[PDB]
Amino acid sequence: SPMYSIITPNILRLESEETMVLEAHDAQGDVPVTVTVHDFPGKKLVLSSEKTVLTPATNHMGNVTFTIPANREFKSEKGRNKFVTVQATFGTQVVEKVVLVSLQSGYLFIQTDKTIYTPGSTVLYRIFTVNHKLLPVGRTVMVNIENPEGIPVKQDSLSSQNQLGVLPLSWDIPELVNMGQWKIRAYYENSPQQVFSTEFEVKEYVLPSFEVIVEPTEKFYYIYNEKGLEVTITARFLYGKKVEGTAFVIFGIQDGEQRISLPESLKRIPIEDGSGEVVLSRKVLLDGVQNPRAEDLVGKSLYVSATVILHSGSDMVQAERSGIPIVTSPYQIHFTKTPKYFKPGMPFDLMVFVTNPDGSPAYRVPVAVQGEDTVQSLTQGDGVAKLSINTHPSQKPLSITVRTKKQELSEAEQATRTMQALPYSTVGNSNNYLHLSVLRTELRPGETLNVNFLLRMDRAHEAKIRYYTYLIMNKGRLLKAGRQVREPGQDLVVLPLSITTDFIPSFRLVAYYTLIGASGQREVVADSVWVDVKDSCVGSLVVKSGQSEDRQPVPGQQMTLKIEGDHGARVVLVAVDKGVFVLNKKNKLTQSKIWDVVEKADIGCTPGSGKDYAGVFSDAGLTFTSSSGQQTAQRAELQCPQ
Amino acid sequence: DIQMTQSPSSLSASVGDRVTITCRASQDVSTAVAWYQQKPGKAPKLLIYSASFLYSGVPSRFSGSGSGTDFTLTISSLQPEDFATYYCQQSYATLPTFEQGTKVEIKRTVAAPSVFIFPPSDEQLKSGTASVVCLLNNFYPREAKVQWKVDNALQSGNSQESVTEQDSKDSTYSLSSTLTLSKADYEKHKVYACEVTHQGLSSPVTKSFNRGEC
Amino acid sequence: EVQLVESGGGLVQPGGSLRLSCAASGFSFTSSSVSWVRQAPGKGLEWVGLIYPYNGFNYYADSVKGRFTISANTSKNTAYLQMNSLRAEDTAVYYCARNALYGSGGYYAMDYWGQGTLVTVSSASTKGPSVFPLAPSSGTAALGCLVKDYFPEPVTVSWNSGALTSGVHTFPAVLQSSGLYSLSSVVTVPSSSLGTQTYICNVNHKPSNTKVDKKVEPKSC
Amino acid sequence: DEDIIAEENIVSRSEFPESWLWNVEDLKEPPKNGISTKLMNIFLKDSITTWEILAVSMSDKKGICVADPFEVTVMQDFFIDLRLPYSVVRNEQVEIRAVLYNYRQNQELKVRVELLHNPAFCSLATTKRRHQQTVTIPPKSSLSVPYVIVPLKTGLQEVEVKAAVYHHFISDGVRKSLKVVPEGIRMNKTVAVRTLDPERLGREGVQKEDIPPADLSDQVPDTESETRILLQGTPVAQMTEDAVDAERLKHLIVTPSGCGEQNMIGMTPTVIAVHYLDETEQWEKFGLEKRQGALELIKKGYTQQLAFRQPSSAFAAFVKRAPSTWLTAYVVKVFSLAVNLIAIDSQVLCGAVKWLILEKQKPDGVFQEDAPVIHQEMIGGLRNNNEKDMALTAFVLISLQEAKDICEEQVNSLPGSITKAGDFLEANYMNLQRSYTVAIAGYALAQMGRLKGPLLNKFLTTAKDKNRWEDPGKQLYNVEATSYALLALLQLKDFDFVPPVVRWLNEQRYYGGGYGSTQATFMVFQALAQYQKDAPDHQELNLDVSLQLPSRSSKITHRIHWESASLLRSEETKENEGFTVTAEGKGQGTLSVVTMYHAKAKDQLTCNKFDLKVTIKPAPETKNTMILEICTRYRGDQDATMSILDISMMTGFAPDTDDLKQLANGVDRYISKYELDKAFSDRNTLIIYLDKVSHSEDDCLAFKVHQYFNVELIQPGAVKVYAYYNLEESCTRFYHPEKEDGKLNKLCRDELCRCAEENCFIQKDKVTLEERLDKACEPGVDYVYKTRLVKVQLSNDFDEYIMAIEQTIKSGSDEVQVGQQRTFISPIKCREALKLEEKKHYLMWGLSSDFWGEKPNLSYIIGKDTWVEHWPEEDECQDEENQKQCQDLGAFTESMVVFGCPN
Ligand SMILES: [Ca+2]
Predict the structure, then answer these.
(1) Burial status of residue D139 (CB atoms within 10 A of its CB: 0-12, 13-18, 19 or more)
(2) For the modification Phosphoserine, which residues carry it (chain A)?
(3) CATH number, domain A330-431, options 2.60.40.10, 3.30.360.10, 2.160.10.10, 1.10.238.10
């Protein structure tokens, strides 16, 4: 008997296009479908547009493209979450699902010309207005400049219509003003809860003549290392030449907000040829704290403070380096890239993510499963090593403890972390599964990714599976849905999936099949997989010299600047004296900062898989609902679980 | 390496005219160029430095310009005192170089020579050799034909010339022709004649003396 | 006043050596540098080398590298060019000039120059000139001097200790087939000035210590 | 001098912005290789530094993108780095360094460095005297050039130093600015803290407020004074006391089960629980997918309820029983309220209404009961037998009024059963003791628009304490009567009496259910559900505040509305004036008045953290040499850790290398090898590093300094102390052989200061008659007097010479009359060369720029352009020598008196 199904995202966003996948399994001939969207609770229609007919021609699969306006009963009513009712009407059969609606419109990023400012000067800023595709929109933004203690002072309301999504603004900082961390707060007219910020410091200062860099030999401090903590100080004039002078360095422990200083550690080294070395002795550290347990320092951090004064006395600068972790192991094991679910009877591929104490990917690091030796794979450039554990059909969870096994370290210095994997439970204990397997190599828009579909179903009914329906989530919405056809006896088939710039920054491939066999049951089997892509720009932008380079220009001089962007694209610019960053480097706009924002707003939560078919859809940020009763759970949470 | 080329190698022009010598570079050289002037038998003199800055003392008619790959020295209203050779020097590149140089010649009206003849000294005869000199004084242009008649017999191959370098005031050349015979040979023949041919003369002018007798 | 003075030029056997010196005065030698440029007979200028008197740093044109050398006595504000393995093609007048730094990024122009000294690299022998009167032939009367059979260049002719400079023409030397040079110095004077005015021509030939002052007047016959 | 660029031809570098190139550029030219390219021609600024250029691009299709920063380094082989502070205090001597750099590799540079003169600053640079050093900077190295200057004029001010190098066409100059500032500091202070709430002692005549000015009589002269108002909106606005919690109503979803009345008992809490949760939007927390299963209990209650539908469209306990009048009306109320939630039949609802009007109504319109219910606890306050024809008429009517929006043309004479029933209850409204029958009738009236006058008053005043319509005994009837009344108050649109009623219901927290709570449940969650609808969406906070300042021309009627997400403003006053601030109508808000000024100093500015004592004296037996002695200690009996002594030489002096190495070898003291290894002449700044210093004693040190270069005037030296961890809290003293406190000769009193480094009076040979008559007519000259010195009064800062005026040879701005006295003023160091003696007569003239004072605080400064000269006595004139002079004065006085100046 026929089954009609709908797939939508778990969260639907205002004003932007959200797609809905429509399927008619075991279908016969043309079948018309009306997609309706009503408010909830109670129904006044909001977009009953989009009618379509899925035909034999397209294997009874089509889609609908719809958009939600920020209408009367959504705008003012906020605080408690809003919902709508998506409703497909396949010929006569109705299928519906309530979905949590988010009031987040798009994204706002705020650039300030400098990171720091004096009283009396002018703050220049631009606001970039884009939708969830990181593409420019023409909306109306509200802007709030806000003094250190949270009091608005200047406020604006403008639209980036006919603007290319670039809003140029400014504000003259008054002379007699408060001194501290000010904020710019911009939000879309429609989304007063989604407020975007940027700090700028105000202070009385003058640009220094040189910068000072403070670097420790290791990016951490191992508590039994008796050599101590070896820091190097580098001073250098802003124009490049090395600095001569004297440096005063001091060390101190930081427990959370608290900050002990260690006066016993204060040194006065010479700076010769722009360089100098200083050490924090282990004794001075341990005799500096009142707890005799060397080990009580683990988890707390160390900070260094360096003050370089030129020999003339004409200038001095201060730099510091904080958050040097005190550690027992040089490494750090994370299970944040591994699915928390396995398929009983199939090997569970545990993706171990090893890192250095600052968070950076490790490399050539051995990892073994506790109990087994050599069951390893030296971690690669991405920081991930793969450990494939065999599993029995039992529904007992897998408790896995991983350990690093770096050779020249000792047992105590080896990093260690444990996890638990839950089994994918089958429908009616059918023991039928779908496993997607994909290889782990950093993808770029141009190369192609093999996606393997392993049909793990028992022979008597397998001939009924004639296709897998697959869906690709990117940037928190439905990027593409298609069909990997299957023919009787094909236990494994590969979809050659090509990567494009639309796949940036990362994506999830969710696929499923459906049938009857293990009893008179409408069974649904699904799997998901998260795959990371190289977080480059969609386009490209590069600034370099046309000025026959290799020369070094002079004050007042002309020069030519090569800009290499996308055709027909707008480009905004700024030049800053790097002395500004000797004083403050926080809150600088970056391309990786744009992607960091984007990926933190994903509605998918799991690296892949799920506790069952409904769980697989939900965890990847997708609803599933069918005329035969099968559906995903209710999601009323706008944020991921914790 | 960095290739520089000065053009033109030589140029003629009349008083009050606009002169422009140019220097060209194989790659960018920014402002690192200087121009010098050199009169004959004298140390060069700085005119322009840093592409266009006029060295102190140098007249305002001198003027530098250019940047990158093309530079030009410009004399706006040429003068008789500007008879010289002009060089372009670069200080970009680690070893500096002066370029091949432009010889600037003054162009003026026709002036005919005052011809003179000098007989051998009595002191010079004591040495057993006779040198007879002919002086074509202050004449334009340079082109001239001097021919020695000895008793009306004409003879090549036993005389040499020296042309003066163009004068700084009146833009004229002087010339000296010197005939050299042995005391013996000189005491043979009688009438020694120098013959001058030139554009400013209606017909060739001849100067001479009869040997011994005054 | 800034002024530079070369010296030490003369005749050298091919292969031989020579030391020119350059007497700087009127500026702090140590804060500037000095260049040696040279000019082959009737040809272009060729820069030879720098010296930074402060610390003795040098630079050399490839045409001279391994043969020439520049040194300095910083107390006597003098610079020196020591030449070795001299060739025929090293024959030139050698100037020294002050390097002044106009732009920024180390561009310099050469603002003061010395007079130069002539160095001549030949097998030939030093020879002094024979100086003969060129007698005036009885409104303007020309008279002169013949400076004959000398080697090498140069000679310096002047008239009445340089009192008479007006309308003098000391012609280029000319290389005789014998191998020796001869030139004429001629001076036009008002014929009336004969009898009253005295006319002595002042030849001087450094290379051979030859000094002559010859009087030139008409004849008795 | 010769062979160097002249100061006048040097153009100083000036453009030193921290950020620039704030430009937009669209890529237009075609994409070769799918990459467009623009060539931008920028003009680099003057700063010698490294710029960082950051490009962000925006595209319709490819979206936003952010380039890697691109660096550009601008640089010269020789330049000045003029190290100016952020600000300096006025009339406070300070030292600044100009750092000269020589990045040439094998070449020293001889530079002439110069401080330009600026009237704003007192320094050795003066009107007619340059301040130029000559220094030699080695290769790959730098050299500090200090300048002591005292800023005299407030505000943004400019310093310029230039530098030419000898023997090269190389020059430089830097023109930076620094903020000169007064003393005091910034003072916040509030005058009023009001609450703009009319109808709360603001009264009927729209709250009219008055807020006087600031005091500001301790203020220091010549500064701003910006007031700042804070017009807040502290909101209980959107008169919406928080709704009843969703987690408390879990027991209300009752599965209806029973006969005909027990089915309607169970359906009551469920239907009203949905009607509530629908409007309050509280389905998120309670359980969203529970609504689809809770609607099916109402559809289960409805489908079961139609099983007790009698042939005549009426309802009762069983089908066997005769029909009840009230139960058929309650079924219309629950079905009318549940029309939005479930599918009701058209035949059913209005069908139950047709039976009621035709069958059950008396002559005057009392819908009397015909079948009393078994479960009598369900009907609530009607259960009481007192006046059960007054309430019972209203209850059935309310079911008609809520169902009237649907049932119109079907039930024909419906308008008429509403009018006559509204006569019976309205007439007998003044015959109701209990608060229950007063209120249940009151909601029936207000729905039509017939609740006015004494019937509208009895409604209001029955409420005990102006909130609840209580009754004696059972408290469930109390909560029911008020909720009917709240539905009445919502329809009336009288938002004055609404808040107190709901506030009490929130402090009851009656969650319904249990037993005998049918009416207390249905009515409290309907009335508080209809409250969230009709309760103001934006309320108001509608103040028309008109601020009228007498300094200002116009008022500023600032509007206020609960809608603008700011609820705050701020004006900026220039003059301390008393202004009115009149509010108008509704809302609430703060109203502060914060001016901001500068006060006087108090004696603890200067050296808050260190004591510094510096002396310079001549040396013992043995060209010129002296003994610098620095004495310092910290503040607080607790040795400071690690400090700096930054010393600068008096021009022409350098430290004794022997005495220095002696010091550096001493313990608790360090001098970098770099400093020691430097030449004798090329060492005019010095840093001595101390390991500590307390406030037990005084840490003292001293060392020989030798004069190597010989020069006139000579600039004071300077010692600066500070701890490494804080440069800001420093202390500097100056030292000079002939000035002490190495202070440049200035002339201060009260606010401002004159630079007094100039010559005392116009100097001195001839003193011709034809000389005096020229120089007495020079442009500025605004007076010429004959004066007798009455009383000489001396001091250390300035000597006050009082002059009597004999005659006024020339009068100017100061309109002095003969006989009167004017005070002349001269510095300490001019007394030596002045010789001003009591009762000796004087001829004095000077400029208009020499008037120190307001009026009549008039003083006369004896500056460089002032001419003073001795006048022998009238009888003393008759004497051999000095007859020549006496006559020329009298001869000069008559030329001036008669002809005056030719101008
Ligand atoms: Ca990625």
Answers:
(1) middle
(2) 16, 48, 275, 281
(3) 2.60.40.10
**A-D contacts (CB, under 8 Å):** 337
- The number of distinct structural domains making up chain D is 6
D177, D157 contact by CB (below 8 A): yes
Maximum Cα interatomic distance, chain C, rounded to a whole number of Å:
73
Which residues of chain B neighbour C95 with C-beta distances below 8 Å?
43-44
In chain B, what residues touch D169 (CB-CB under 8 Å)? 49-50, 53
Superfamily of domain B1-108: Immunoglobulins (2.60.40.10)
Q: What is the DSSP letter of D670?
A: E
Q: How far does B63 lie from chain A, in Å, by closest CA?
A: 22
- Give the β-pairing of A61-67 and B173-182: unpaired
With contact defined as beta carbons under 8 Å apart, do C8 and C19 qualify?
yes
Same domain assignment for residues D116 and D210: no
Chains that touch C (3 or more CB pairs under 8 A): A, B, D
Give the CA distances from residue D261 to residues A598, A642, D375, in Å, rounded to whole numbers and listed in that order: 58, 48, 7
Q: Six-digit token pair at D35?
A: 């990459």
Q: Do D40 and A561 touch (CB under 8 A)?
A: yes
Count of C-beta atoms within a 10 Å radius of residue A200: 22
Distance, in Å, from the CA atom of D543 to the CA atom of D539, rounded to the nearest integer, reads 12
Domain B109-214 class, CATH top level: mainly beta
Q: What is the DSSP letter of A447?
A: B
Same domain, D617 and D665: yes
Question: Beta-strand (E) ranges in C84-190?
Answer: 92-100, 109-113, 117-121, 130-134, 140-150, 158-159, 168-170, 174-175, 181-190
Q: What is the CATH number of the domain that holds C6?
A: 2.60.40.10
CATH 2.60.40.1930 fits A107-207, yes or no: yes
β-bridge pairing D141-151 and D121-122: antiparallel
Q: How far apart (Å, rounded) are the C-alpha atoms in residues A328 and D180?
A: 55
Q: D807-843 b/e with 16+ CB inside 10 Å = b?
A: ebbbebebeeeeeeebbbbbbeebbeebebeeeebbb
C-alpha D234/C-alpha D194 separation (Å) is 12
Decide if D547 contacts D538 (C-beta within 8 A): no
Half-sphere exposure of C53 (CA within 13 A, CB side): 25
Q: Which chain B residues touch A548 with a CB distance below 8 Å?
A: 27-28
Q: Is the peptide bond before B141 cis (omega within 30 degrees of 0)?
A: yes
Tokens of D776: 């007495």
Residue B42 CA from chain centroid, whole number: 13
H or E segment at D417? helix D414-427
Of C107, C135, C169, the CB nearest to B121: C135
Q: Which residues in chain B are contacts of C183 at CB distance < 8 A?
A: 162
**What is the CATH architecture of A537-600?**
Other non-globular (6.20)
| Dist CA C159 CA C141 (whole Å) | 15
Find the domain containing C89 and state its range: 1-123
Asked if A47 and A86 touch (Cβ cutoff 8 Å), the reply is no
Method of determination used here: X-ray
CATH code matching the domain that covers A1-106+601-632, chosen among 3.30.479.10, 3.40.50.720, 2.60.40.1930, 3.55.30.10: 2.60.40.1930
The architecture in CATH of the region A432-536 reads: Sandwich (2.60)
Task: Give CA–CA dist A233/A227, Å, rounded.
Answer: 18
Q: Tell me if domain A208-329 and domain A432-536 are identical in fold.
A: yes
Closest-approach residue (CA) in chain A for B31: A557
Contacts of D767 (CB under 8 A, 6+ apart): D869, D885, D888
D49/A238 CB distance under 8 A: yes
